[model samples]
Target: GSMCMPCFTTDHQMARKCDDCCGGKGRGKCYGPQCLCR
Candidate 1:
């Protein structure tokens, strides 16, 4: 399963909704200002 968390990702996708981002094909946890990704 995939999990989305707030992180300052080395990349730059920005973020996604936790509910919408989580439980997906992949996971992206951003830790910056305030990303809406799991």
Candidate 2:
């Protein structure tokens, strides 16, 4: 079976929210200060 689950790296997993990944006023999907798949 296949499932879609959200995954965050070690740095991001500890974050309270996506802000830690995106930046000030965090935007769309990100991966710890850098946009996802950037």
Candidate 3:
């Protein structure tokens, strides 16, 4: 929900586990209401 174009970065929303941000390749997971990449 916070992604911006023309930039070399990506933003991810944490309503649910996103495929590109939560597993398989990305090292993030949902915890509480935040992304557990940290």
Candidate 4:
């Protein structure tokens, strides 16, 4: 439900949490409704 990528209509899409997305590796980021890992 962010201003960027709307995930309301698209439920259970990307990572629900940043930690989960990045796996506490500091190599990923939550770009609103999706994830961006580096």
Which stretches of candidate 2 lie above 4 Å from their native place? 1-16, 29-38
Q: lDDT score of model 3?
A: 0.40
Across 1-38, the per-residue lDDT of candidate 4 in tens digits comes to 22222223255534444445456555455555545554
Candidate No. with top TM-score: 4
Give every collision pair in model 1: 4-38, 5-38, 6-30, 7-30, 7-31, 8-31
Residue pairs that clash (backbone atoms under 3 angstroms), model 4: none
Model 2 lDDT per residue over 1-38, tens place: 12122335764443334434444343335433444421
lDDT of each: 0.44, 0.38, 0.40, 0.45
State in Å the error of residue 30, model 3.
Answer: 0.4
Query: lDDT of candidate 2 vs native?
Result: 0.38
Scored by lDDT, the top model is 4
Q: After superposition, how far is residue 23 of candidate 2 from its true place, in Å?
A: 1.0
Q: Cα RMSDs of all predictions? A: 7.0, 9.0, 9.3, 7.1
Candidate 1 regions with alpha-carbon error over 4 angstroms: 1-4, 17-19, 22-38
Please say which candidate is ahead in lDDT: 2 or 3: 3
- The order by descending TM-score is 4, 3, 2, 1
* Window of ten residues with lowest summed lDDT in model 4: 1-10
**Better TM-score candidate (2, 3):** 3
Tell me how far the alpha carbon of residue 38 in candidate 4 is from the true structure, in angstroms, after superposition.
Answer: 2.5
